[PDB]
């Protein structure tokens, strides 16, 4: 109920969709002065400022990143590495964090909702949704996250389908 | 009144539009395990399953056809060859079948409504609208239909304009 | 207030926005039987009648221009050479005319604001906005206009922005 | 409707239809003491005295001028050259005169209503309608008229059809 409204209020201005002949196939992320955007989602950036840049690539970590200018670094997402197990907020409701794995209940999940960040009860991004795999009743996510040392860890289960 | 509501209830899930940079220019048809789609309507299929296939072509009969998989063959249109003369249901109201010819009263008919199937009082597809020609007050249709033997007959009046 | 509403009634009929991939970049004006389009604005005019017409270019005055078809010639704007000082109308409120300089109170005027015809106290076009600069607490504009002889005159302040 | 009563009551005495097989093709006008009749209109004058004349041809201006007998020189239209902008009183209502061009709202104007005079608010002929073209929502007219020098001037828009 109110969780989706809080997601729409937090991700209103900072989330920009990716257009491809009128089709919405992905979402970029503006956090820490960096613009995260995946490889398989191909299209034009809806924002005029973020589209006229050059994104350095990382095909192993499946991420394109760029440098957000200084006049927009205050209006970004927050990020942290301290995260316990339990529940977190996602755009379609809740997501479970168990044994270092993000799980989403079934019914939701198609092609197009790639790049949506995972939020917490305070308002900090803990993961970035990149893919998903159907596991019985409860699907698992293939995402990226950080740690205490500062190494971007990409978690990928078996036989995932890119969204 | 209720005829357009019955057309919208029957053609809700089985009719998929064709997109071309946000413009709706045609409609495919899923009937008999086959995906009918014309030549002159060019664009991407809005459905994700039907777009990732290969359609065999027939330029003389003006039809591209493909094989719908077995998990969707039950959710198709119905088709028959037994047709009398008189009235039939169409998306913009009624259509007259006289002397083996489909006629539509004027006022309706533009570029974009190509591929809409013609239904009957029971719910079976009897023809597929491909083109139209303005004849006095009452326009004629250039369509395809079947017969008792099983030969796809394409009926085309003189000086038609493709929609 | 009141002034903007009759301007909206005029712009709904004859001022046509351009179609960039998701947004509006500029506005084509149809005045006196001659379609006008700015150069730095790139896209497609919404009418399929006004899209097919090939435009001649005038790089000194920053405007493509083409010939209007004969049916559309009565449904055009009107143009006036004589402009006294005071207040004129515009889509975003009012515009001051002082010492031959169309100036606008600030906060309005950004990207996607190009080709909007400045109207008068009768409904005739006296200028066409191409951009402007923020002159302190009040922004001035860079318009083309007309004089008594029939000579298209462009005025542009220092370091204007192509909107 | 009050101006059309004035036009009909002035045309009841001084306007003569040119009938071919009973069908109206045009109107002879007796203005200023000389008979006027267009070229392309075929038939004979309804008045018996005017039909037995030798009309001198003038093929450029689409007119066939004649002379009026002395007993009929007082029963003629008066005319003028003076024409400010605004409205004038045609046979079917009003006619706009802007930028040196007579325009009628559309629909009216077919084969037959040629040679009709255009009156002013005083009761003087300022133009003689020959033909016109439909510029969409308003029809420009091809007329002959006079000027301050005393010279017959014909105005002709593009692609005018002879009425």
UniProtKB/Swiss-Prot annotation, chains A, B, C, D:
Modification comment: Phosphorylated on serine and threonine residues.
Positions where Phosphothreonine occurs in the chain: 15
Residues annotated as site: Involved in dimerization of the capsid protein: 88, 121
Region feature Ribosome-binding, mapped onto this chain: 1-14
Location of Phosphoserine modifications: 12
Taxonomy, superkingdom: Viruses
Domain Peptidase S3: 14-163
Active site positions, chain numbering: 40, 62, 114
Compartmental location: Virion; Host cytoplasm; Host cell membrane; Host nucleus
Subunit structure: Homodimer. Homomultimer. Interacts with host karyopherin KPNA4; this interaction allows the nuclear import of the viral capsid protein. Interacts with spike glycoprotein E2. Interacts with host IRAK1; the interaction leads to inhibition of IRAK1-dependent signaling. Part of a tetrameric complex composed of host CRM1, host importin alpha/beta dimer and the viral capsid; this complex blocks the receptor-mediated transport through the nuclear pore. Interacts with host phosphatase PPP1CA; this interaction dephosphorylates the capsid protein, which increases its ability to bind to the viral genome.
Role: Forms an icosahedral capsid with a T=4 symmetry composed of 240 copies of the capsid protein surrounded by a lipid membrane through which penetrate 80 spikes composed of trimers of E1-E2 heterodimers. The capsid protein binds to the viral RNA genome at a site adjacent to a ribosome binding site for viral genome translation following genome release. Possesses a protease activity that results in its autocatalytic cleavage from the nascent structural protein.
Domain comment, as recorded: The very N-terminus plays a role in the particle assembly process. The N-terminus also contains a nuclear localization signal and a supraphysiological nuclear export signal (supraNES), which is an unusually strong NES that mediates host CRM1 binding in the absence of RanGTP and thus can bind CRM1, not only in the nucleus, but also in the cytoplasm. The C-terminus functions as a protease during translation to cleave itself from the translating structural polyprotein.
Protein name: Capsid protein
Originating species: Venezuelan equine encephalitis virus (strain TC-83) (VEEV)
Lineage: Viruses, Riboviria, Orthornavirae, Kitrinoviricota, Alsuviricetes
């Amino acid at each position: 109920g109110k969780r989706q409204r809080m997601v729409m209020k937090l991700e209103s201005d900072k989330t920009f969709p990716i257009m491809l002949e009128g089709k919405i196939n992905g979402y970029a992320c503006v956090v820490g002065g960096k613009l995260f955007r995946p490889m398989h989602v191909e299209g034009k950036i809806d924002n005029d400022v973020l589209a006229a840049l050059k994104t350095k690539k990382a095909s192993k970590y499946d991420l394109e990143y760029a440098d957000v200018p200084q006049n927009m670094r205050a209006d970004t997402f927050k990020y942290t590495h301290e995260k316990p197990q339990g529940y977190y907020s996602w755009h379609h409701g809740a997501v479970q964090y168990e044994n270092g794995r993000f799980t989403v209940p079934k019914g939701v999940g198609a092609k197009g909702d790639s790049g949506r960040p995972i939020l917490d009860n305070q308002g900090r991004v803990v993961a970035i949704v990149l893919g998903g795999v159907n596991e019985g009743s409860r699907t698992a996510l293939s995402v990226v996250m950080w740690n205490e040392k500062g190494v971007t860890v990409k978690y990928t289960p078996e036989n995932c389908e890119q969204w």
